[PDB]
Amino acid sequence: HTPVTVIGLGLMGQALAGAFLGAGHPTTVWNRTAGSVAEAVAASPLVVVCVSDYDAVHALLDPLDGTALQRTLVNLTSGTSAQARERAAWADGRGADYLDGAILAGPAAIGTADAVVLLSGPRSAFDPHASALGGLGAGTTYLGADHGLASLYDAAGLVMMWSILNGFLQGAALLGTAGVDATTFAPFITQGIGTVADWLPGYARQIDDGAYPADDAAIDTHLATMEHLIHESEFLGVNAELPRFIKALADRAVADGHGGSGYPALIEQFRTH
Amino acid sequence: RMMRNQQAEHTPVTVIGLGLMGQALAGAFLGAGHPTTVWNRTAEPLVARGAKSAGSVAEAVAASPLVVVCVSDYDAVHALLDPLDGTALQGRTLVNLTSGTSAQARERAAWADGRGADYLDGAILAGPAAIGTADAVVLLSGPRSAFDPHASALGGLGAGTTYLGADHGLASLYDAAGLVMMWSILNGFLQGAALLGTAGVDATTFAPFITQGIGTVADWLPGYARQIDDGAYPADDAAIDTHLATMEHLIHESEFLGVNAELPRFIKALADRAVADGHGGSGYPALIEQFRTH
């Protein structure tokens, strides 16, 4: 329906440009290895940027004439909320609408229901291009006004991801000591993940009030079991840092008199240092 | 059909220890038709439902060919069972669903054998409420000779009742894997809630997003398991090096917003070690080498 530019053609850049062409957009394109970045920007009212990091964004966009963006810039590069909030300020000083986003999917998933693409920024920047941007997948989702949100969501997703992979590896190492294969273990552990996931909405309700009922599973009672996990790990000669970390956090909660509360009282530990 | 020797009405079972979980276990055995004897430190609801209550631990043990123990820890197991006559357990099968380490399980297996008993060591991965339902998960490990003759009786605890294999240590190890994954997920959730909290997004807004993501990551595990089982860690476009920059961001983000950054640092620490052993080019599962070393 409308012209769009794509800047940066890593795997993901290509995929993004692919989806825009495949949805019938007159699509202009530019890469490191259109004549120039300025030519690419001048081509379309909607400009999408996907490059390795915000330093590259800085390097490609800062040198532009002050008039060049006076346009909606959508920055799907991964970075911190502070980086996103800076670019928002910069873009506003250059007279552009700015959305900051993050891609939580591989290039293959772009343009499909598997794609997840988070966008944050003011409705006035998003609504006019909602259709165009929906071309990247039904998982394309507008999170709200604060330009930092996509980065923060991406961070919550990443920390959870590494958390799970690390718990999986710790388990595989433990069971490995008795000769159980990782593929034998996996079906068991994926059932368990599902079960724990279903506890999260309720744990969310507890965190949103400041109320952490024990429900017969108080932090105290966790403690003995966490010690076992450590002893087990040390004794079999596998790494015990993760189980010690886990017990360290719960010790702090106990020391702040939260021993009697449910596990979600540990959110206080994750809020300080 | 099941046969008449396999009808619950005909298999007596003892339950030792009546904490929440003990009561639940006994409850299920009664509810499935088993003549159930019971014993506790502090000697009711169950005798209300038909259980026989027992004078002593020795009286309980003598009552049934299948003896189930569920108490706070292996020290209590020691305290209740060690003082028994050497004849008391001969020809009985002892199922110990107390939580403990693999070493504790393997010790009791040796002990039980010296006392002429068959021995299964298990672990319960569910709350008392789930016992006797499809939600129950009860892991058992030990020789088939000890499990098969009581498979039906034990299935009374739930369809999730599962026999893992011969080594008595397995149920403890599976329990540990499940627990470390559980704490791992909750901690990842709390870190995320703290981060998003800085911008005033509520935990309940966040949860749906994070549970979709958990599902996506879970589906990767069978493939990662195949990689670990060979010693082959292809990058598949997602090499450990690539992760690294993103892990630094997560750290900077956390420090800068003033929320705790220990977890993201821990995560980056492990990946550094892999990089330093020249695994930078491999897929994430190459980190299993880090989890294998003290």
UniProtKB/TrEMBL annotation, chain B:
Transmembrane segments: 12-32
Domain 6-phosphogluconate dehydrogenase NADP-binding: 13-165
A Pfam short name: RedAm-like_C
List of residues binding NADP(+): 18-21, 40-42, 71-72, 99
Highest rank taxon of the organism: Bacteria
Family note: Belongs to the HIBADH-related family.
UniProt lineage: Bacteria, Bacillati, Actinomycetota, Actinomycetes, Kitasatosporales
Keyword hit for Cell membrane: no
Keyword Repressor listed: no
Full protein name: Putative dehydrogenase
Keywords for the protein's UniProt record, in alphabetical order: Membrane, Nucleotide-binding, Oxidoreductase, Transmembrane, Transmembrane helix
